[PDB]
Amino acid sequence: TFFGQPLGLSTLFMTEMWERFSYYGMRAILLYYMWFLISTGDLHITRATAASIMAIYASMVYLSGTIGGFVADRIIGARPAVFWGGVLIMLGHIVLALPFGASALFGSIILIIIGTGFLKPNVSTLVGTLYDDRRRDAGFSIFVFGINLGAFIAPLIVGAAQEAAGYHVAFSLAAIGMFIGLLVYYFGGKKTLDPHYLRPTDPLAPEEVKPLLVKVSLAVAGFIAIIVVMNLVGWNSLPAYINLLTIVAIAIPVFYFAWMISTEHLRVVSYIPLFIAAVLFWAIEEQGSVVLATFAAERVDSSWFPVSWFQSLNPLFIMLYTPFFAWLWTAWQPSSPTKFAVGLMFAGLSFLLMAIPGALYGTSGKVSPLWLVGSWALVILGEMLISPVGLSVNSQMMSMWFLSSSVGSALNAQLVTLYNAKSEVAYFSYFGLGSVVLGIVLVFLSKRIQGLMQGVEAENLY
Ligand SMILES: CCCCCCC/C=C\CCCCCC(=O)OC[C@@H](O)CO
Ligand SMILES: CCCCCCC/C=C\CCCCCC(=O)OC[C@@H](O)CO
Ligand SMILES: CCCCCCC/C=C\CCCCCC(=O)OC[C@H](O)CO
Ligand SMILES: CCCCCCC/C=C\CCCCCC(=O)OC[C@H](O)CO
Ligand SMILES: CCCCCCC/C=C\CCCCCC(=O)OC[C@H](O)CO
Ligand SMILES: CCCCCCC/C=C\CCCCCC(=O)OC[C@H](O)CO
Ligand SMILES: CCCCCCC/C=C\CCCCCC(=O)OC[C@H](O)CO
Ligand SMILES: CCCCCCC/C=C\CCCCCC(=O)OC[C@H](O)CO
Ligand SMILES: CCCCCCC/C=C\CCCCCC(=O)OC[C@H](O)CO
Ligand SMILES: CCCCCCC/C=C\CCCCCC(=O)OC[C@H](O)CO
Ligand SMILES: CCCCCCC/C=C\CCCCCC(=O)OC[C@H](O)CO
Numbered sequence: 001t002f003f004g005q006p007l008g009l010s011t012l013f014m015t016e017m018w019e020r021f022s023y024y025g026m027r028a029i030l031l032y033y034m035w036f037l038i039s040t041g042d043l044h045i046t047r048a049t050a051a052s053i054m055a056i057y058a059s060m061v062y063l064s065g066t067i068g069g070f071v072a073d074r075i076i077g078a079r080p081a082v083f084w085g086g087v088l089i090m091l092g093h094i095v096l097a098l099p100f101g102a103s104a105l106f107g108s109i110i111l112i113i114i115g116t117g118f119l120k121p122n123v124s125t126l127v128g129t130l131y132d133d134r135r136r137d138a139g140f141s142i143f144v145f146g147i148n149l150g151a152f153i154a155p156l157i158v159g160a161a162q163e164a165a166g167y168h169v170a171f172s173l174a175a176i177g178m179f180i181g182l183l184v185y186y187f188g189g190k191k192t193l194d195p196h197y198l199r200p201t202d203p204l205a206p207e208e209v210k211p212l213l214v215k216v217s218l219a220v221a222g223f224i225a226i227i228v229v230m231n232l233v234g235w236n237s238l239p240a241y242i243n244l245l246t247i248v249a250i251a252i253p254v255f256y257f258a259w260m261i262s263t264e265h266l267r268v269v270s271y272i273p274l275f276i277a278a279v280l281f282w283a284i285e286e287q288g289s290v291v292l293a294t295f296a297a298e299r300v301d302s303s304w305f306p307v308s309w310f311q312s313l314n315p316l317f318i319m320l321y322t323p324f325f326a327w328l329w330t331a332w333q334p335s336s337p338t339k340f341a342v343g344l345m346f347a348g349l350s351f352l353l354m355a356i357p358g359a360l361y362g363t364s365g366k367v368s369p370l371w372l373v374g375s376w377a378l379v380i381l382g383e384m385l386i387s388p389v390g391l392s393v394n395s396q397m398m399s400m401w402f403l404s405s406s407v408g409s410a411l412n413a414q415l416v417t418l419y420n421a422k423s424e425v426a427y428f429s430y431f432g433l434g435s436v437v438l439g440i441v442l443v444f445l446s447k448r449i450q451g452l453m454q455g456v457e458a459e460n461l462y
């Protein structure tokens with residue numbers, strides 16, 4: 001067994017671990033890469049836009065994740081989704097390993113967006129297919145833990161590689177990480193995965209094909225029309241396109257939620273504060289690789305080590321916190337809304353903490369790296385409370401997980417452009433305090449939507 005679990009777990013464990021290695025390896029150096037392309041005159045954007053790009057990239061990645069489950073379940077099968085998803089991710093990194101500049105960015109981004117949409121939701125699904133069970137929750141716990149190992153070592157290894165041999169070599173290591181994942185996935189999968197997941201388990205019925213096709217067509221066509229009109233009237237700058245993608249990412253939950261919209265009416269409305277809290281939390285957490293990455297580079301003395309390494313603090317604390325929260329939930333209980341609040345409070349505190357060094361020491365010198373260590377400590381603390389990775393210690397839960405992190409990232413694509421040396425303290429203070437307060441607002445708000453909900457239930461029962 002693999003820690004009391006089937007050997008399929010280790011196969012799937014290692015597969016995701018190496019995917020995460022390639023992904024977060026890339027995330028830890030990609031913004032610095034764009035900075036480098038800007039300094040050499042090769043990429044003609046502001047650093048604000050480069051920051052904005054990191055954010056919308058991530059948003060599209062997680063948006064992709066919400067439909068990959070569907071594509072695998074209905075059209076191509078979970079097992080081919082992970083494989084061809086992996087292949088696309090590997091090509092995405094290979095594109096940046098080629099001796100090119102800015103021109104390869106977009107191609108890279110599209111491949112990894114599509115590949116990650118295919119791979120991430122479906123590797124999770126395949127974990128379930130190993131069980132018919134009490135082990136079922138243990139296997140997911142183990143899975144989640146070692147997923148993070150990949151996220152942990154990648155900025156160290158890739159970050160060192162970049163320092164030594166350059167960006168192109170560094171990106172090629174990311175490509176090799178995914179490759180390793182593919183080998184283990186392919187040959188390990190044949191041994192331990194069920195053959196029926198080589199096909200879709202819920203294939204499109206004959207009468208479902210045309211309506212699906214019509215819907216996809218109209219969406220693509222409308223999106224193309226919008227872009228054509230944008231170009232006709234002059235709104236065709238990079239930030240313009242970033243704004244279009246922001247709006248589309250934000251519009252989706254609004255339409256999805258207004259769509260599902262007596263007792264169940266209050267349940268759907270009950271989710272909305274929780275969804276909004278989740279979005280704000282991911283907003284703060286996803287700035288780790290943009291705003292904190294910027295602060296690391298500009299405001300910390302890192303003359304003696306790769307500054308990309310700071311991104312390891314995120315998965316590090318997830319692993320440090322896991323055994324503790326394993327005890328916490330079995331020994332203890334607070335409602336699901338209360339959790340989302342406190343988590344957003346902790347994320348709020350991680351930004352308020354970051355306002356201190358500037359307020360105290362000014363912004364033109366260099367502060368201790370421990371400010372960042374503290375900030376990641378707090379925000380990850382919030383992640384144990386608010387994320388399903390803190391629940392591990394479903395499909396709708398999974399898609400809403402991908403969607404909320406997508407929306408948070410879309411929000412960041414607008415917000416991180418406000419961040420610079422001149423605005424550092426005001427930025428960290430505002431969004432930090434704003435987060436804490438929305439954290440307090442959203443807890444009492446959902447509690448008493450739930451309170452009124454259990455009122456209507458009492459009426460119907462007795
Ligand atoms: C899990 C608990 C949350 C963590 C608590 C937050 C602690 C955050 C920051 C503490 C380090 C602040 C920097 C202290 C320091 O050594 O500054 C020295 C300064 O003079 C430059 O070397
Ligand atoms: C309920 C969820 C809403 C999420 C969107 C929050 C957006 C709030 C404000 C955006 C405009 C920036 C307002 C000025 C500001 O915050 O300054 C901060 C920074 O620019 C430093 O000056
Ligand atoms: C363009 C560069 C990369 C080219 C890809 C090379 C593809 C080589 C062989 C194709 C094998 C397709 C296997 C797909 C698959 O379903 O894998 C499932 C495995 O059996 C384990 O789940
Ligand atoms: C199921 C979709 C399969 C294909 C996904 C769409 C792929 C979209 C773009 C891929 C572009 C790969 C090449 C990019 C590239 O080489 O950029 C280099 C620059 O042109 C300069 O060298
Ligand atoms: C479904 C599409 C998702 C695309 C979102 C990715 C973020 C948007 C754009 C990233 C591309 C950055 C390249 C900028 C650029 O092409 O500038 C011109 C270069 O100088 C070309 O030589
Ligand atoms: C049959 C599978 C093919 C893809 C497997 C993954 C291979 C990924 C990368 C291969 C090695 C990349 C070469 C390194 C490189 O390009 O040097 C960097 C610049 O050219 C110069 O600094
Ligand atoms: C990236 C390509 C553009 C977006 C395509 C999204 C899906 C659009 C239409 C789905 C039609 C595919 C047919 C499904 C299929 O191959 O099997 C048919 C049913 O599973 C059995 O009748
Ligand atoms: C990459 C461009 C694709 C954009 C197509 C617009 C959206 C219409 C169809 C997308 C293909 C099917 C989407 C599946 C879906 O709606 O999700 C359902 C659940 O979230 C999965 O169980
Ligand atoms: C860029 C626009 C994307 C819209 C086109 C995507 C749809 C792609 C193909 C539609 C094919 C119609 C279904 C054909 C099909 O595979 O079903 C056949 C049966 O399953 C064969 O047993
Ligand atoms: C390159 C084409 C760009 C097309 C984007 C147009 C946007 C149109 C419709 C939104 C796409 C559907 C996203 C998937 C989605 O609905 O989320 C899943 C559900 O919310 C949860 O089950
Ligand atoms: C299968 C191919 C995938 C194609 C994905 C369609 C992406 C649709 C919209 C994304 C727009 C991003 C534009 C990126 C870009 O380079 O814009 C820069 C402009 O040249 C601004 O001067």
Ligand SMILES: CCCCCCC/C=C\CCCCCC(=O)OC[C@H](O)CO
Pocket residue numbers: 049052238239240242243250411413414415417418
């Ligand atoms: C119903 C959800 C509403 C969420 C949107 C609220 C936050 C949106 C914008 C905050 C204002 C500061 C960002 C403005 C900005 O810098 O523009 C971004 C650039 O034009 C794109 O790179």
Ligand SMILES: CCCCCCC/C=C\CCCCCC(=O)OC[C@H](O)CO
Pocket residue numbers: 226230235236237239240241243244247248251252255
């Ligand atoms: C369920 C998905 C529905 C998607 C509908 C969203 C499309 C609605 C409006 C698109 C607005 C056009 C993009 C905005 C834009 O280009 O900003 C302008 C730039 O800032 C120019 O500097």
Ligand SMILES: CCCCCCC/C=C\CCCCCC(=O)OC[C@H](O)CO
Pocket residue numbers: 356
């Ligand atoms: C399991 C025990 C957890 C105990 C740690 C609780 C820490 C909570 C709050 C600490 C206050 C954070 C501000 C630190 C600070 O401002 O220091 C000032 C700088 O050191 C100036 O040198």
Ligand SMILES: CCCCCCC/C=C\CCCCCC(=O)OC[C@H](O)CO
Pocket residue numbers: 349352353355356358359425426429
């Ligand atoms: C468990 C406690 C976790 C640590 C969080 C402590 C954060 C408390 C207060 C942060 C407020 C920092 C704002 C300072 C400030 O804005 O000063 C203004 C400056 O003068 C700008 O020039």
Ligand SMILES: CCCCCCC/C=C\CCCCCC(=O)OC[C@H](O)CO
Pocket residue numbers: 301309310312313316367368369370
């Ligand atoms: C155990 C692996 C941790 C993952 C690597 C994360 C690297 C991020 C920060 C390094 C922490 C450095 C400790 C504090 C320190 O050494 O201060 C040195 C400064 O020069 C003092 O201002």
